[PDB]
């Protein structure tokens, strides 16, 4: 009956589900971050040299720098039969609130621990906005997520690729003492009573990450029929439908400005609620958040199911073996060269007594003088001279390194090509395109347009407050992949020169260019160059 | 050789007392300051007089308090070696049957709390199977006698049989030699009904204790006793520290072969109608604690006497016993022979007071510690893995801090069939 | 002192920058060749020997 | 509550917490741009 | 292991943690190394009061 009791429990399940490959992540990203040599056994034994010969780094640099010339961006697209623009207001939005800079971060950084760990996360999130909002004085953000491994646990009874099966979600946030402090000023909590939740560390882990506070965030997905009301509207038209929680306040404001009910259904939909939590107790329990679905969107390298368990890989683990036994090997060679002795004669001391100042090392005598006799034996006894061997590198240890060379030259090429990975990247941001389009939907106002104008029919409470009003003819556009652009401006330059690019020198082609030419930046020249392409165009009807 | 990796599966466990116990958590900050207990107000009650002319008699304000206190930690400190090979395929096995021992553990210490420390006693003289309809006279009368004493029973109550005594009900169910529904369900099945004569829960707890009889006889009060009800008294410097209400001792002529657990009732005692303190036809039970000294014992409902003229009023208003001890009343023993014990109880009685361990924390490095919760009871844990020196192996620790509580010893209760002689 | 503008005018620039576990890494080029260029250079003082 | 001690507390957390990439960064610097030999204690002996 | 900044003083240590996981303990230790020089004891000087028989 408790709730803390049963968000633990499926914390827990879902915890001991992932830990072999949360294990083998964490393993994957400290191997390719921090070093190869991966003993925690090594500060307690005798200090032995232990080099860092790379062989898998230059791949790792060559795949990120080629995922990063490929720029991937949501693409809205009208629906089958739908309005042929319906999309223009959504990709305005999404341009308008996507090209900051924090949007690029999260997405290089998911990219990035995708090729190295296997796994990588984003999130999306919701804050008002008084200066330059995006639309009803809110803007939408894409924050970053570091080590989404360990940081984000999914539901483990969830069989899909971006997770949109999975009903829950906890998030272990880990700030220093100034964070949790604001953390706690934001969020209305108590920033005296200091937070604590799990965050384990690996035993190689040298440092301590002092002073920092973790807590969980528990996002959770309940699907339910709602009750939705249906109005007429008085400016045009007449079926409009809203939901009776959208709707809680300006019930009366409705019919004051000229909504008059019609009819009242149920609708099914998804609502996302989450919980700000703690190991010992549950410090917001369901903040309702905008949106139908969980705003966590995770991307994934090579993903499966072996026996009902989930495995995701990125280019590190398959080449772990080679590279430990090459730094091996290679430390082990240079143990050799340093510690042996050096190729120097073997003397008897009664051979060269008396004649030591000669074998030093100086140039001062044309030769090497030998004693001869003995006063016992007579004369000494002959026997050739033996030189100390010179040191050598044995013909395993070079086999074994060349061979572990090549075996992790062999298994460190992705693909032939990063295309498996691209698509992975693509349909990680259709995800993110589904998700964005619920929470602009939930909080944004969207403009209707009609064929007789884009009509935005909005009322204020009595507490100054604005509520939107949005129709369930919503999901007008769906979601696909296309090139990363800055803003509409921009994309419809480069559609604009695609079509160019195919339109032979005729009447269409005298078109597009006046067309490209209208669609230019300002600034003197180019700008009286547009103003004559304008006139043109108008001229031309 | 070829040893596979099919399991066999021997043991299933259940428990439902565990589950139904009511779970506590409160701030581990202030805990640790308070010393792992802290104190919970009681519902006043309210004395009342008759008469017009009130001068000079107008009553304080009294209000009583219980205390709630944790125990030790219950672990499964056991030892890894990385270098063989039955100590890597059983490890995982190990780290599930010690999640399934912990559940077993706490569920039999709420039986064991809920059984030694159950006030009231319902006994019979015989078995269940022996006369017709015994099973429901047996929980019949746990329900009325928690119905006279005014007991408050919002939460819900429960009455758990053994199993013996489970098959003795069915059986009387089934040689009925009518099938209607009652019948029918507990001849294909062995349930007897989901609820029995009031219990809205009925169920059967193969895990509870069997109170071996008592060896005490001839014992008799030492003293004339009054035990008043008092919510703080004053220590050596003065400071004023609370009282439980849940224990009183009393010197009694020799606690020879008393032992925690055992049921007395003193013979002349009467029990009260609480609200209304009205004498009921049923002699007070008690259930003795401690056996503090080798002349006293703590008996967990303190007897309150309403004829007791040395009570101020808002005292008296606590009375539960209708007369106090009088330096010579015989104390009859209940429990005059061994028989595994049937525990009723009000489902607001027993709870779980629950403090986490904090080895997650920075002062733990070098220490890989994770949140571990506990199957069907609602519990969470610690599990922490620690490498040895120069070897591939570790220890492994699952540890889990709990403390069972009965708030309201006068709610629990116990059933003892067969107490003849 | 109130200075201009809302952000900090501290601008930074990084090269292969990530988090490991809670604790920012940062490597440019030389890290990883450091211990090649070491016994490179042992090697050759040995050899100048 | 003092001024000083909170912008102290704000600057040794973030010194405390960013110690080992700047001392691997400075080692890196001086490999590179004045001397990949820094015995110093085997150089003097 | 994480360094440990001395207030006042512009000094470092080393603050350390360990773990027991058969008794459930820890221990941490701030270290501090340091060594105060004279370089110039002729240069350093004394001043002493009241120094009659």
């Known amino acids: 009956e408790n709730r803390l009791e049963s968000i633990l429990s499926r914390f827990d399940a879902d915890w001991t589900a992932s830990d072999e490959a949360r294990r083998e992540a964490k393993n994957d990203l400290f191997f390719s971050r921090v070093s190869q040599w991966d003993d925690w056994l090594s500060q307690y034994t005798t200090l032995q040299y232990r080099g860092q010969f790379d062989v898998v780094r230059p791949v790792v640099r060559k795949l990120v720098s080629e995922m990063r010339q490929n720029p991937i961006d949501v693409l809205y697209r009208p629906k089958d039969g739908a309005r042929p623009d319906a999309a223009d207001v959504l990709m305005g939005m999404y341009r308008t609130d996507m090209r900051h800079n924090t949007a690029k971060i999260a997405v290089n950084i998911a990219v990035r621990e995708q090729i190295e760990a296997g796994v990588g996360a984003w999130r999306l999130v919701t804050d008002y906005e008084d200066q330059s909002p995006t639309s009803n004085n809110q803007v939408i953000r894409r924050e970053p997520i570091h080590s989404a491994c360990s940081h984000v646990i999914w539901d483990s009874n969830s069989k899909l690729m971006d997770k949109s099966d999975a009903r829950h979600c906890t998030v272990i946030h880990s700030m220093s003492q100034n964070g949790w402090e604001d953390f706690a ?64 306040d300006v019930i009366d404001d409705l019919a004051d400005s000229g909504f008059i009910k019609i009819a009242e259904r149920q609708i099914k939909r998804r609502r996302v609620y989450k919980s700000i939590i703690t190991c010992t107790a549950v410090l917001k329990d369901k903040q309702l958040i905008a949106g139908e679905h969980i705003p966590i969107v995770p991307v994934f390298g090579e993903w499966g199911f072996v026996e009902d368990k989930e495995v995701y890989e990125g280019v590190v683990r398959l080449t772990k073996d080679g590279q430990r036994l090459r730094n091996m090997i290679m430390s082990f060679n240079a143990d050799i060269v340093a510690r042996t002795p050096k190729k120097k004669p073997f003397f008897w001391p009664e051979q060269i007594a008396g004649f030591e100042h000669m074998y030093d090392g100086n140039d001062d005598y044309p030769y090497y003088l030998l004693n001869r006799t003995d006063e016992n034996s007579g004369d000494l006894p002959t026997q050739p001279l033996a030189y100390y061997e010179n040191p050598e590198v044995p013909q395993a240890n070079a086999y074994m390194l060349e061979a572990a060379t090549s075996a992790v030259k062999e298994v460190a090429t992705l693909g032939v090509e990063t295309y498996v990975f691209q698509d992975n990247l693509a349909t990680a941001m259709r995800r993110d395109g589904e998700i964005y389009q619920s929470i602009v939907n939930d909080i944004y106002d969207v403009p209707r347009n009609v064929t007789i104008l884009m009509a935005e029919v909005v009322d204020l409470a009595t507490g100054e407050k604005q509520v939107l009003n949005d129709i369930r003819g919503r999901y007008e556009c769906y979601t696909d992949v296309g090139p990363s652009f800055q803003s509409m401006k921009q994309q419809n330059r480069a559609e604009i020169l695609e079509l160019l690019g195919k339109t032979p020198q005729g009447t269409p082609e005298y078109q597009l260019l006046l067309l490209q030419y209208f669609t230019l930046l300002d600034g003197k020249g180019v700008e009286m160059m547009r103003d004559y392409a304008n006139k043109q165009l108008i001229q031309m009807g | 050789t070829l040893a596979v990796d099919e399991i ?117 003289p015989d078995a269940i199977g022996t006369n017709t309809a015994d099973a429901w006279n047996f929980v019949a009368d746990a329900e009325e006698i928690m119905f006279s004493r005014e007991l408050n029973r919002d939460m819900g109550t429960s009455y758990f049989f053994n199993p013996q005594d489970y098959k003795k009900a069915g059986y009387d169910l089934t040689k009925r030699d009518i099938f209607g529904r009652i019948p029918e369900e507990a001849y294909r099945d062995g349930t007897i009904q989901r609820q029995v004569a009031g219990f809205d829960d009925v169920l059967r707890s193969p895990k509870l204790p069997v109170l071996t009889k008592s060896t005490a006889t001839g014992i008799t009060v030492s003293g004339a006793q009054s035990f008043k009800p008092v919510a703080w008294q004053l220590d050596n410097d003065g400071n004023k520290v609370n009282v439980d209400n849940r224990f009183a001792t009393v010197t009694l002529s020799a606690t020879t072969g008393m032992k925690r657990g055992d049921k007395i009732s003193f013979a002349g005692v009467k029990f009260l109608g609480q609200m209304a303190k009205n004498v009921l036809a049923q002699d007070a039970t008690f259930s003795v604690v401690r056996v503090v000294d080798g002349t006293h014992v703590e008996i967990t409902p303190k007897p309150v006497a309403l004829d007791d003229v040395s009570l101020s009023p808002e005292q008296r208003a606590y009375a539960n016993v209708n007369t106090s001890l009088a330096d010579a009343m015989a104390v009859n023993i209940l429990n005059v022979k061994d028989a595994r014990t049937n525990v009723f109880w009000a489902d607001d009685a027993i709870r779980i007071v629950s403090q986490p361990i904090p080895a997650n924390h920075e002062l733990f490095a070098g220490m890989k510690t994770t949140s571990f919760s506990i199957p069907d009871v609602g519990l969470n844990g610690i599990f922490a893995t620690q490498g040895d020196i120069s070897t591939l192996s570790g220890l492994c620790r699952i540890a889990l801090w709990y403390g069972v509580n009965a708030t309201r010893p006068e709610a629990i209760g116990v059933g003892l069939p067969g107490q003849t002689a």
């Open chain 1, 185 to 248: 000023e934001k969020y209305d909590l108590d920033a005296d009573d200091i937070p604590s939740f799990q965050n384990p560390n690996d035993w190689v882990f040298p440092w301590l990450t002092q002073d920092t506070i973790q807590i969980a965030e528990f996002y959770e997905v309940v699907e339910k029929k709602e009750t939705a009301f249906i109005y007429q509207d008085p400016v045009t038209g007449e079926p409009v439908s809203y939901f009776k929680r959208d709707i809680k």
């Open chain 2, 8 to 124: 066999i599966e021997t043991i299933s466990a259940i428990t439902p007392m565990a589950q139904k116990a009511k779970k506590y958590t409160p701030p581990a900050a202030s805990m640790q300051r308070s010393s792992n207990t802290i104190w919970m107000p009681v519902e006043q009650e309210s004395p009342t007089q008759e008469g017009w002319d009130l001068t000079d008699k107008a009553t304080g304000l009294l209000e009583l308090n219980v205390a709630v206190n944790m125990g030790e930690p219950d672990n499964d400190f056991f030892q890894l070696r990385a270098d063989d090979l039955r100590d890597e395929t059983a490890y995982r096995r190990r780290i599930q049957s010690a999640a399934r021992k912990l559940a077993n553990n706490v569920e039999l210490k709420v039986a064991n709390m809920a059984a030694e420390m159950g006030s009231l006693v319902i006994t019979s």
